[PDB]
Amino acid sequence: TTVDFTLHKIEQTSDEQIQNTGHDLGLTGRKPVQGAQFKIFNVTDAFYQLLENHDKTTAASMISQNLGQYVNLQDPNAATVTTDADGLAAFKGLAAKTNGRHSVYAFHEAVTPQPYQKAADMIVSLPVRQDDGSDLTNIHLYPKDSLVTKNLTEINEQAVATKDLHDVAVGDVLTYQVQFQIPHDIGALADHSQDTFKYNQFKVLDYMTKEGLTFKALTAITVDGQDILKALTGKMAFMSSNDAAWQQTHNYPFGFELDFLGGTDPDAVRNLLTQYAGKRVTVAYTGIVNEKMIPDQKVGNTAEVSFDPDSKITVNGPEIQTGGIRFFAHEAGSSKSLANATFILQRMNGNVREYAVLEGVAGTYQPTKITWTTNQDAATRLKTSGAETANLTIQGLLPGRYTLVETAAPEGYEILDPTTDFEVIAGTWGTKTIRIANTPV
């Protein structure tokens, strides 16, 4: 006589010990995960052999921690079903008894879809008996895939609503957070080994291919509501785009590589991680938007979590972008470029005028920060070049409505209109280059 196992693969974004009854839980209202490949193994003999020296709990635990020690994982006979769009994968018609004992079955996620981490290898020992004193013939399991994620969480230390695209100003500090799971078997030894651990690399690589950000700081590493970073530092390996090391191995203009087990004392780290095994880690860091952040340029990041050199779990973060504007100061009635025309940048703030002060500083302004004052004389005086198509450029601005105010015409000219109202368009230089005419004398 036989038994069926129907699996319900589901997404996990937090810590959650919830027990498998084996009973059908119906509409649980949880996101299913598709494309998880599961293999099943009869471990009844191996289990009962352990059961001579160890209790029931310890036996099942030993098999979970090193399933490939007790079975040939790449067995062609081993029944394999892949999880569908509802997260469903049924293994049917399995022997209820094996060599005179109630059967023990082990389940192993062999291929885990991106960007998930695999479920722990689960062990079921029959029977699973109903409260009416009768065995279940269909056993329902809810294995969990932990979702690797990356978000932009704060801008200038204020929480922002999460979205795929953010508008930034030059000199903004951006807080990012990468989340992932400490493996359930982090502290286990390699299958058939007394002298080598199973895990020898727990790496987080995060970078941007395009320019725009300068690495500021790694702010925290937390798990289980505890700050782990103070304990780790020294014992693990760390590189940032600010370190001369970085340009040796990578050529991304921004990023960091962290390895919990690449440091001076791996084993001490593995110990600490084992204490929080199966739980969710948040690695937080900050970056500063720099003068090389340009308009018409969306720039994102990729984070890669890897446990060996040959594999990785990859996730993309949101893209950021910035505004700019171009002007052309010229002689009324022609296209003669007028250099040395003097302007200040204005905006309204609840029916009050503020004027721009640029920290970084031709006609091309590319500041490192823009602050705002109601003292008009403190405003940065902007000068035009003699360039052809546009002779005043500004970038790193938020989108919205501004006013360019001309405070001195070039020698030999007089101002037509002192004020030019305009609009910075999100992530672009704008509709067109704005022409400003000055009349000669």
Author numbering: 37 to 397, 401 to 480
List passages from the publication reporting this PDB structure:
So-called major pilins polymerize head-to-tail into the pilus backbone, with ancillary pilins added at the tip (adhesin) and base (anchor). The L. rhamnosus GG genome also carries the genes for another pilus operon called spaFED9. The tertiary organization of GG-SpaD is a tandem assembly of three Ig-like domains, wherein a middle domain (M-domain) joins together the N- and C-terminal regions (N- and C-domains) of the pilin subunit.
To study the effect of lysine and catalytic glutamate or aspartate on isopeptide bond formation and structural stability, alanine-substituted mutants were prepared. X-ray diffraction data were collected for two mutant proteins (D242A in the M-domain and K365A in the C-domain), and though no isopeptide bonds were present in each, their overall tertiary structures remain unchanged. In the C-domain structure, the observation of continuous electron density between Lys365 and Asn477 confirms that a cis isopeptide bond is present and located in the first (A) and last (G) β-strands of the CnaB fold. Catalytic Glu445 forms a hydrogen bond with the O moiety of the K–N isopeptide bond in a hydrophobic pocket.
